[PDB]
Write a protein that binds this ligand. Structure first.
Ligand SMILES: O=c1ccn(-c2cccc(OC(F)(F)F)c2)nc1-c1ccnn1-c1cc(F)ccc1F
Ligand SMILES: [Mg+2]
Ligand SMILES: [Zn+2]
Length: 313
């Protein structure tokens, strides 16, 4: 109980900021996560020994792919940590408990391939889960780990609170399916503008949590420009590998995934910022005003990509 985890001064301060980068030292990530759970949730929410053992199994079950890896998981957990910490009073106890876990577990056992490729390859997971294929698998892996011996970090919850946290985690993980993002944000926008948005409507909270999960998931676009620009290299390494596997299946990939159309990346990013990221952090800032720094960082990077196209970098 009286073991408060502590980061060096620079991290201790910078970890509070939305644009924090967890750094290249892999063996510090688990401790960064535990620091966040304790500050966000309490040193009581989890038995340290089970938490440590859960984290390390979750790590083992992420793969050495270029983007969808252990570092992405911990990055997406930190963004949620910054949103929870900047909206102290808006979230219940279970929610704070489930969401950080859900963020750490949301891409479990990702092989670096889109749902589309799994469907076209005719992967067994595509027969097991017809929609949100990888996202149903990720949740499945989370439950499986929770059910290992000494791995049940939710042991002290009652049967009610236990089903409530697993359902929070399931909706949060399912919501990271970008195909579901667009519909969800539109309804949130319409609700917020007609003033029907009501954070006591459980159905409405579900949507707000989904949008937060998209915002956390996409948070490489909210970093300082060098991080955002270097993360893009890892993102496109996976897109181009999937483009290669599409061509092996005798299908021309969309240009995003075609490494022969590398030239088009900077314009492809503009579209994604205009169609996806900016609308995402705008609707989020409207519903949760203290998240405005993610909108501002995202606009700044949109501006940086506009400077790439114009030959100014
Ligand atoms: O930079 C990017 C360019 C394109 N897409 C993308 C992914 C999926 C469908 C898509 O098309 C559509 F616009 F219609 F959705 C575009 N995503 C990113 C991106 C930025 C940050 N995270 N990710 C990301 C999210 C992901 F979910 C997966 C991989 C990523 F790199
Ligand atoms: Mg995913
Ligand atoms: Zn992800």
């Amino acid at each position: 109980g009286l073991m408060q985890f502590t980061l060096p001064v620079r991290l201790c301060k910078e970890i509070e900021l939305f644009h924090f980068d967890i750094g290249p030292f892999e063996n510090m990530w688990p401790g960064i996560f535990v620091y966040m759970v304790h500050r966000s949730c309490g040193t009581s929410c989890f038995e340290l020994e089970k938490l440590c053992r859960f984290i390390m199994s979750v790590k083992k079950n992420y793969r050495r792919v270029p983007y969808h890896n252990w570092k992405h998981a911990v990055t997406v957990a930190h963004c949620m940590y910054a949103i929870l910490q900047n909206n102290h009073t808006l979230f219940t106890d279970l929610e704070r408990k489930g969401l950080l876990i859900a963020c750490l577990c949301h891409d479990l056992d990702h092989r670096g391939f889109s749902n589309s490729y799994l469907q076209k390859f005719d992967h067994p997971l595509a027969a097991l889960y017809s929609t949100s294929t990888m996202e149903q698998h990720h949740f499945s892996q989370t439950v499986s780990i929770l059910q290992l011996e000494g791995h049940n970090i939710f042991s002290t919850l009652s049967s009610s609170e236990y089903e409530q946290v697993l359902e929070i985690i399931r909706k949060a993980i399912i919501a990271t399916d970008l195909a579901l993002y667009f519909g969800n944000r539109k309804q949130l926008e319409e609700m917020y503008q007609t003033g029907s948005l009501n954070l006591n409507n459980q159905s409405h909270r579900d949507r707000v949590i989904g949008l937060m999960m998209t915002a956390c998931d996409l948070c490489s676009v909210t970093k300082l420009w060098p991080v955002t620009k270097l993360t893009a290299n890892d993102i496109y390494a996976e897109f181009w590998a999937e483009g290669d596997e599409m061509k092996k299946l005798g299908i021309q990939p969309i240009p995003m995934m075609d490494r022969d159309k590398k030239d088009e990346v900077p314009q492809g990013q503009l579209g994604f910022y205009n169609a996806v990221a900016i609308p995402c952090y705008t609707t989020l800032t409207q519903i949760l005003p203290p998240t405005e720094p993610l909108l501002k960082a995202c606009r700044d990077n949109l501006s940086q990509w506009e400077k790439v196209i114009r030959g100014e970098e």
